[PDB]
Design an enzyme around this catalytic site. Structure first.
Site, PDB file in Angstrom:
ATOM      1  N   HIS A 194       0.814  -1.207   0.000  1.00 19.90           N
ATOM      2  CA  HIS A 194       0.000   0.000   0.000  1.00 19.90           C
ATOM      3  C   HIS A 194       0.856   1.270   0.000  1.00 19.90           C
ATOM      4  CE1 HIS A 194       0.306   0.156   4.534  1.00 19.90           C
ATOM      5  NE2 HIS A 194       0.075   1.445   4.350  1.00 19.90           N
TER       6      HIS A 194
ATOM      7  N   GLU B 247      19.446   7.041   7.910  1.00 19.45           N
ATOM      8  CA  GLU B 247      18.710   8.198   8.385  1.00 19.45           C
ATOM      9  C   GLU B 247      18.342   8.185   9.870  1.00 19.45           C
ATOM     10  OE1 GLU B 247      18.169  10.889   7.161  1.00 19.45           O
ATOM     11  OE2 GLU B 247      17.297  11.013   5.163  1.00 19.45           O
TER      12      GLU B 247
ATOM     13  N   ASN C 114      17.480  11.936  11.750  1.00 17.59           N
ATOM     14  CA  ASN C 114      16.605  13.093  11.582  1.00 17.59           C
ATOM     15  C   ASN C 114      16.400  13.213  10.071  1.00 17.59           C
ATOM     16  OD1 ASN C 114      15.686  15.823  11.056  1.00 17.59           O
ATOM     17  ND2 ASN C 114      16.249  16.296  13.173  1.00 17.59           N
TER      18      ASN C 114
ATOM     19  N   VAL D  96      17.499  16.767   8.316  1.00 18.91           N
ATOM     20  CA  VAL D  96      18.849  17.308   8.451  1.00 18.91           C
ATOM     21  C   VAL D  96      19.924  16.322   8.015  1.00 18.91           C
ATOM     22  CG1 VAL D  96      20.558  18.267  10.033  1.00 18.91           C
ATOM     23  CG2 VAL D  96      18.101  18.533  10.520  1.00 18.91           C
TER      24      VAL D  96
ATOM     25  N   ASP E 292      -0.078  -7.430   1.965  1.00 18.62           N
ATOM     26  CA  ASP E 292       0.417  -6.060   1.926  1.00 18.62           C
ATOM     27  C   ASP E 292       1.943  -6.077   2.043  1.00 18.62           C
ATOM     28  OD1 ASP E 292       0.640  -3.340   1.934  1.00 18.62           O
ATOM     29  OD2 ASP E 292      -0.292  -3.036   3.911  1.00 18.62           O
TER      30      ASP E 292
ATOM     31  N   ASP F   2       1.453   1.922  19.928  1.00 16.83           N
ATOM     32  CA  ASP F   2       1.164   1.302  18.641  1.00 16.83           C
ATOM     33  C   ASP F   2       1.971   2.011  17.554  1.00 16.83           C
ATOM     34  OD1 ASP F   2      -0.086  -0.036  16.533  1.00 16.83           O
ATOM     35  OD2 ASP F   2      -2.011   1.021  16.760  1.00 16.83           O
ATOM     36  N   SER F   3       1.903   1.494  16.330  1.00 14.47           N
ATOM     37  CA  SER F   3       2.564   2.142  15.209  1.00 14.47           C
ATOM     38  C   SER F   3       1.444   3.021  14.650  1.00 14.47           C
ATOM     39  CB  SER F   3       3.051   1.116  14.175  1.00 14.47           C
ATOM     40  OG  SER F   3       2.019   0.267  13.715  1.00 14.47           O
TER      41      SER F   3
ATOM     42  N   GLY G 126       2.358   6.806   8.648  1.00 15.41           N
ATOM     43  CA  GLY G 126       3.713   7.281   8.425  1.00 15.41           C
ATOM     44  C   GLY G 126       4.738   6.221   8.785  1.00 15.41           C
TER      45      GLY G 126
ATOM     46  N   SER H  82       3.934   3.055   8.155  1.00 11.15           N
ATOM     47  CA  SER H  82       3.622   2.021   7.161  1.00 11.15           C
ATOM     48  C   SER H  82       4.826   1.573   6.342  1.00 11.15           C
ATOM     49  CB  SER H  82       2.515   2.515   6.217  1.00 11.15           C
ATOM     50  OG  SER H  82       1.287   2.669   6.917  1.00 11.15           O
ATOM     51  N   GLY H  83       4.908   0.266   6.099  1.00 11.64           N
ATOM     52  CA  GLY H  83       6.009  -0.296   5.328  1.00 11.64           C
ATOM     53  C   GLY H  83       7.229  -0.608   6.175  1.00 11.64           C
TER      54      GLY H  83
END
Ligand code: CA
Length: 223
Positions: free
Chosen positions: A40, A52, A54, A57, A84, A171-172, A175, A177-178
């Protein structure tokens, strides 16, 4: 991630950020030139960002590599979110070190009760919106298939498992997602869906990676 903690710069070396001019999903690096994410989260013009912390920056450990191809699972159903999962190949192999490293695929499925690390740059509030710039972390247990199905009647397939708490608060979220769900050093899940975020009796639902190992390996071998 709601109710989590600041991971720490590069403490989750396999965590990637999918960028299309902005961060829109997370992903997991499984080898120097392949990333696993949620179907999705598909869209064109994807640039994978590794190393990564931040995301706003340049800190010194980033590797920005555009995707050469995206492969959504053959049986992905966007209406039910069954299957998914999707693979993303990098145009060039990433340089793997200790701050940027791949995560191993499972040799066996994870069981209810096992603790896992979920991470991402998603929303940190259940009500309202607040995007963190740095990576957030959450340690949560896999929930029984029984409680998962009872929380989401007629919606949980054999390719899904819940993690978190029925109590809510942790929880997650949008944003994330994946992103990864790692248990005992192995990628067991992918942040997939849920009703809102960290709400009572609505735990997070994740893609059950162990069911896709064959497909992942085979697909990689021929692409
Ligand atoms: Ca950065």
């Amino acid at each position: 991630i709601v109710g989590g903690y600041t991971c720490g710069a590069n403490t989750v070396p396999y965590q990637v950020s999918l960028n299309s001019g902005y961060h829109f999903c997370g992903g997991s690096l499984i080898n120097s030139q392949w990333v696993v994410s949620a179907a999705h989260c598909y869209k064109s013009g994807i640039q994978v960002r590794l190393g990564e912390d931040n995301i706003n920056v340049v800190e010194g450990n980033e590797q920005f590599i555009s995707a050469s191809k995206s492969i959504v699972h053959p049986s992905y159903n966007s209406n039910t979110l069954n299957n998914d999962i999707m693979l993303i190949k990098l145009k060039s192999a990433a340089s793997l070190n200790s701050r940027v490293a791949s995560i191993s695929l499972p040799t066996s499925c994870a069981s209810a009760g096992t603790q896992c690390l979920i991470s991402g740059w998603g929303n940190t509030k259940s009500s309202g919106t607040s995007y963190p710039d740095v990576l957030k972390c959450l340690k949560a247990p896999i929930l029984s298939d029984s409680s998962c199905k009872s929380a989401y009647p007629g919606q949980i397939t054999s390719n899904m498992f819940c993690a978190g708490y029925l109590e809510g608060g942790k929880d997650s979220c949008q944003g994330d997602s994946g992103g990864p769900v790692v248990c005992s050093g192995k990628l067991q899940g992918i942040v997939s869906w849920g009703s809102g975020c960290a709400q009572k009796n609505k735990p997070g639902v994740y893609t059950k990676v162990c069911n896709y190992v064959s497909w992942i390996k085979q697909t990689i071998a021929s692409n």
